């Protein structure tokens, strides 16, 4: 019930089995048996050996999304504040638009009067 290791052949090596190979360049390899360690030490490619799991995988042998926006209060305008601002649909927005229209009209008339 230790850490579970994998081999040259990709097989599972249970505790008390096989040998661990520590190369001089720092790489550490573990093998299930001397058949696997001889193939590795002879520089044999595991993808060309039919019982290796790398071969059976190379040859294919045998085999969320969301977008949630959470509303939050901000400094100066609470959640109720922004709700009251965004719920100005029933003719309040039109009233603001028409008062802006008349403000622009009176500003333009004042500008014409001042220029002339």
């Amino acid at each position: 019930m230790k850490v579970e290791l994998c081999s040259f052949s990709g097989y599972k090596i249970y505790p008390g089995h096989g040998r661990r190979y520590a190369r001089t360049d720092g790489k550490v390899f573990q093998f299930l048996n001397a058949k696997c360690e001889s193939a590795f030490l002879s520089k044999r490619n595991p993808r060309q050996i039919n019982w290796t799991v790398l071969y059976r995988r190379k040859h294919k042998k045998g085999q969320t999304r969301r977008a949630v926006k959470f509303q939050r209060a901000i400094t100066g305008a609470s959640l109720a504040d922004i709700m009251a601002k965004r719920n100005q649909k029933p003719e309040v927005r039109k009233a603001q638009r028409e008062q802006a229209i008349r403000a622009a009209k009176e500003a333009k008339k004042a500008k014409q009067a001042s220029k002339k």
Binding site: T75, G76, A77, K85, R97, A100
Partner: protein
């Protein structure tokens, strides 16, 4: 509710700055009092007179 974690909602330090983002937040369609629908942040320090600061809108 977890004590002090899932409750007592804290506010964002500052609201939208791009006029498109203000309109998106407040459901503005087009050309309705946009410069006065911006959120004004109130500064109310004890040692100074209180006032409210408005951000410079962009685009």
């Amino acid at each position: 509710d977890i004590p002090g974690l899932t409750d007592t909602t804290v506010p964002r330090r500052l609201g939208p700055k791009r006029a498109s983002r203000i309109r998106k937040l407040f459901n503005l369609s087009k050309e309705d009092d946009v410069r006065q629908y911006v959120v004004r942040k109130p500064l109310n320090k004890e040692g100074k007179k209180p006032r409210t600061k408005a951000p410079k809108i962009q685009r």
